[PDB]
Amino acid sequence: KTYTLTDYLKNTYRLKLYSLRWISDHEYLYKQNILVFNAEYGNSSVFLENSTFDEFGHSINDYSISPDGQFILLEYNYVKQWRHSYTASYDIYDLNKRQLITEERIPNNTQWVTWSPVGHKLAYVWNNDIYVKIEPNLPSYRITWTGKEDIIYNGITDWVYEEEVFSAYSALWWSPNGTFLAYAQFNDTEVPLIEYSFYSDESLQYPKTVRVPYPKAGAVNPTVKFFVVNTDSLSSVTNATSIQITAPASMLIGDHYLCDVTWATQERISLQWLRRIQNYSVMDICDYDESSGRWNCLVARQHIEMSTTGWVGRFRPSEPHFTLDGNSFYKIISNEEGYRHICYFQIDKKDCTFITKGTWEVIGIEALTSDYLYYISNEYKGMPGGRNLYKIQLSDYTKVTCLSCELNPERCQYYSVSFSKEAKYYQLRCSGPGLPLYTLHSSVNDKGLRVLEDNSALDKMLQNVQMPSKKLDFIILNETKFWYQMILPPHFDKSKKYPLLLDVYAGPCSQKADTVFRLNWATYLASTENIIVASFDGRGSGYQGDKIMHAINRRLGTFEVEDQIEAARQFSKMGFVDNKRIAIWGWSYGGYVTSMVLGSGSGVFKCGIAVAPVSRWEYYDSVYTERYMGLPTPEDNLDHYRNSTVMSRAENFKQVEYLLIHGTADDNVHFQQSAQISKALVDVGVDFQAMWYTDEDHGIASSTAHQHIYTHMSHFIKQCFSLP
Template identity: 50%
Template sequence: PEDRSIKITSNGKENVIFNGIPDWVYEEEMLAVKYALWWSPNGKFIAYVEFNDTDIPVIEYSYYGEDQYPRKVTIPYPKAGAKNPTVRVFIVDTTNPEGLGPKEVPVPAVIASSDHYFTWLTWVTDNRIGVQWLKRIQNFSVLAVCDFQENSNSWYCPENRQHIEESQTGWAGGFFVSTPYFTSDTTSYYKIFSDKAGYKHIHYIKGSVENAIPITNGQWEAIYIFKVTDDAIFYSSNEFEGYPGRRNIYKISIRSNPPRKQCITCNLRKERCQYYTARFSENAKYYALVCYGKYKIKVLEDNLELESAMENIKMPKTDINKLEVDGITLWYKMLLPPQFDRSKKYPLLIQVYGGPCSQNVKHTFGISWITYLASREEIIVALVDGRGTAFQGDKMLHAVYRKLGVYEIEDQISAAKSSLKQVIHLGCINGTVSLFFLNIIASIYTERFMGLPTESDNLEHYKNSTVMARAENFRNVEYLLIHGTADDNVHFQNSAQISKALVNAQVDFQAMWYTDQDHGIPGLSSKHLYTHMTHFLKQCFSLSE
C-alpha cells in the first residue's frame, strides 16, 4: 500500500480509449461487468482490455436537470450494422511493469480476419490464460489457450490450442458464450455448450471440442458451473421433475466409475424452495445456499421481518403449468386473486417480455406490481414463455433467430386465445409489451439474434420487425406509451418514432415521459409509473377506481 503507483497506460481518452474498463456496449451487452482487467492467480501478471471507440457513432440526449439550460449527454453507441469498437488484450508483468511494458495477446487468425468481439478472459496459471473471441456474426466462438514465453517475453497462442464452438442453428452460447473451468492439469476443462440434441450440457474437453465428452445429457439444460475440483463438479440445472423454471444444485463425483450424480437441493425444502443458487468456497468445502423461494432455509438470513409483514397480506395464488399450442409446449405462470372463484369472470393481463434467452416462468418468490394487481385489483396476470425463451433446448431458443418480433407476440396471443381461456373463465384480455426498433438498438445485442441489416444478410427481416408500418393496427386498441428521456439503453428515439408513426396514422393513444429517468425508471418515478399504469388498466378493463 505504501509503494508508489505505477502508470501502465497513457493513451486513455474520454469516450474514445477505455483501458481496463469497458465502453457502453461491452459493459451492457457482452461482459455484464464494469471492469475489464484480471489479475493472475499469484498476482505476477495483470491482463486488461483496451476498447477503442474511435469513429463510433454517438447517441446524444438532453439531461434537463434544474438549470437554465439542459446538459447534453454523449455516448459512443454502435447500433445494428454500425462500426463497432476495436479491442486488444494486453498483459503486464507487475514485477517490472515500466521496463517490460504491456504485451499484446494475439487474436487467432480465424477471428482476426473479420469484425470480431472479445468475450472473456480466464487465468489458468500465472503463465497460461484462456481468451475467448467471437465473430461479429455471433455463431462462431474461439477459446484460445495462450502461454507466456520467457525467452521472447511474449504470449503465444498455438493453433492446436484454439478451440472452436460453432452453432448451426443460431448464435453461440446462451445470452453469453459460457466460460471454461480448467482442471488441475491446466490443459483440460469443463464447459457448457449445446450437445447434438440441441440442449445446453456440461462437456469435458481435452484436445478438441469435436471430441468433447458429454458429462450431462437429457432434455433439460445445465445452467451454470459453480466449482470444479479434482473430485467433483458442482453445477445447477433444471432437470428435476421436468420444470424448466426450477434450479437445483448438483454434485458429480468424477473420480467414481461411472461418475456419480447427487442432487444437493432437490428434496431439501421442496415445499418451500424450488429455485436455488450457491456460492462455494475456494476448495468447495463450504458453500452458501441461496433460495429464491418465500421461506427461510438457514439462519444466515431468516426473513422474519418479511414473514411477519406478510401475515396480514392476502397474497395471490400461483399456478405454474404448460400448454400445448400448435405442437409447441408453452410454460405459463398465473397469479390468481387470493379469493379466486372459478365460476366468476376475471380480467386477464399478459405481461410480455419474451426477449431472446429470457425466462419469465420461474419458481421464484417476489413482490411486484403484478402481485398488487392480482391481490388488490383482482386481475389475473399471466406470464408465458414462448419461442425464443431459454433453458428448453436450442429448438425453442433459436426459433426466433433472424426473425425477432414474429413468434414472441404470436405465442402470447395464441396462448391467451386458444388455451388460457380453457384454464380460467376470462372476461377480457389485455397486455403489456416492450416495443422498439431493432435497427436502432445496440449492435452486439441485435446482431446476435438478427445478423446484419444489409441486403446481403437480413435487411428484409429488420424491416418486417418494425412497428412503423403497422401503426394502423393500433387504431382499435387502448395504447399507453411510456419511456424515460435519459434511457441510455433503449433510447427515447424509439418512442419518438413510434409516436410519430401513430400520429401520422391518426391513431389516438396515451403517452407518459419520465424526465431524466433511465431504462429502469427508478425512485419516485417508479411509484408514479405503476400508479399510472394501474389507472390505465382499470380504465381498459372498466374497473371501478
C-alpha cells in the first residue's frame, strides 16, 4: 500500500513530537496531564492533573507558569487574528492556594500576556494599552492611555511589524529580573487600510468590510516610539511614568523601523534600528541612570551594520547575545566574503573580530555560557541543507566541537536545540532525513542522558506503506553549486520516465532543499501518483552567503525565476524525467514565481498552480517588499516594479494550463493580487482554472478548506498529467 491523499489530509501517520518547556535549570514541563520531568534521572511528578479545570466549563487553550512557579496562567476563548496575533480570556490559578483568583481579574479580549522573567509580576495588553499586575490578585497599573484601535499600538505590533519585523504580536520586553518593562508604540494614523469583504456565517445578511492599516510598497508607514517604564516604582495614585528612548540621529533623518530589542544587563538595553532603505542599521546600547531617572544611549556606543550588496540581516539584523556583564556581545553578521559568521563585539569598540569563518553560515546563536558559545550551522560536510549544533570555546576560537554530527550521521542531519535556563542541559531535535529524533543531553560533558522520542510508532506502521525517498544534491551552474531535492516515488527506476512537479518558494533567503523529513502533499504525489516532486534553491536563496542571496537585490522576479526554469531544464537532462509532463506550483512567493515562470513563455512547463500569489510588488507590504525592491518611485526602482508583474506576462499564459487559487479574507497577500491576475488573463483571452476560498486567509488553514484545496490541486495535477 501507499501514502494516499487521505493519509496526508487526515494524518494517518503522525510525526510524534516531544515538545518541552524548560521551567528551571534542572527541570522541564511536558504535556503527557502536565508532568514535571527531572533532566538528570528522567523521573516525573504529575505537576497538574488533567481534570483540575474540568471544574471550569471553558476549554483551556494554553497554560503558562510564572517563573517562580507559584501561579499558572490559563488561556481560553482563543480567537486568532493574524500569523501570531490573537485575543483570549485568562484566569490565574494560585498553585499554593489551589484555586482561581476572582477579584481584580484579567480582562476579556487581552491581546497579550507575559510573566516577568523572574517572580510573578504580570504584564498584559488590553485595548491597545499596557497593564502591569505586581501580584495576580491586586489591581493593575495603567501604563499607557494612548491606546486606540487600528491607530495607536502600545505593547503590541501593528499588522506589518507583526508579520515582517518581530514575527510576534508582542512588543513588550521585560528586563532580566523584571525590574523594567520596555515596550514599543506604533502610530498607524496615516497608514492606509486594505479593505475586503468578510462573508462570515450564512446567517449574516450583509457582508462585513474588514479594514486593516496595511502599508503597501511605498505607502505611508507606521511610525515607532520606544519606552521603558520602571515597574519597581508604580503608584496606585500617580500615573505611571514611561521613559522614552529616541532613535539614533541617523535614523530620525527619515522613515525608520525598530527592528530588534534585546536586554543586555539589568540596566543596559540594546536597540536595533533600521532605515526604510533596509541596507543601514544602527544598534544603540542604552544604560539606565539612577541620578537622572532616564535612559542614555551614547553616540559612542552605536554600532553600524550595513550592506552595499543588498539589505542587512537575513530578514532583519541578527540579534546580539551579551556576556553576563554586558560589556561584550556576539551577533551574526555578513563577513567580508559575504558569509554570515559570528562576530565578537566590545561595547565600546567599533571593530569586532570574527570568531568563525569559512564557506558556510552560522544559522543562529543558541546559548551563551561563560566558558562556551553554542551555535547552529550548515558547515557539516559543506551541506547548506543540514543543521548541527556546535560548541566554540571562548578562550580558543579554534576549539570547535560538533555536538550533533556523529550522534547519528545516517538518520540525523538537521538539528534544532533547546537549552535549560542555565544551559546545564539541552534537548536535540533532529528532523531529518530519518524520522525526527528527540534526545536529552547534559552540556557539562555532552554525554546523552536518554532518547526522548524516536518515532518507533511511526517507524513501525511505515514499513507497510511504499514510502518515497528524498534525494538531496546540487547542480553546477556558472561554476557554482545550487542545491536541489527530489521526493522520489517508491521503487524508483531511473530507466523509466516520470512526471515532475517543481515545488517552489524561491523567495529571498528561501531554502527548499534541505535534509528535513516531511510527510506532506509531495509525499502523497510521490507515494501514490508516482510524481517526482523536485525543489531547487537558485539565486536569491539563503544560507549560502551573500553572493548567492543578494543576487536578486533590487531585482525580484528575475534570477530566482530564471533558475527554476534552468533547474527544470537540468532535471530533464537527468534521464528519468518526462519532459512532456513537468509542472510547477507554489504558495505566496512560490505562487508569484510559479506564475512568473508559467508566463515566461519558456515552453518547459505544461502547467502550474499558484496559490495566493503576489501579482505585483506594489500590492504587497512595505517592509518586506522594499527590503528587496527599494521604493516604487521614478528616482528609485519604479521601472523594475513595473517590469516584474505577472499581469505583463498574461499573453504567454496561452501556452500552459493554469490553476489560480486564493482566499477571500487573505490579509497578507490580498485577494486583489489574484483578482488582477485573472482580469489580466481574461483581457487576453487565456482560459485557466480558478478557485476562491470564502473567508480563508493566507493560510487556507481551515480543516475543510485545507482538505478542499489539496484535493482540488490533486485533481488538477492528476489531470494535467493524464492520471486517472
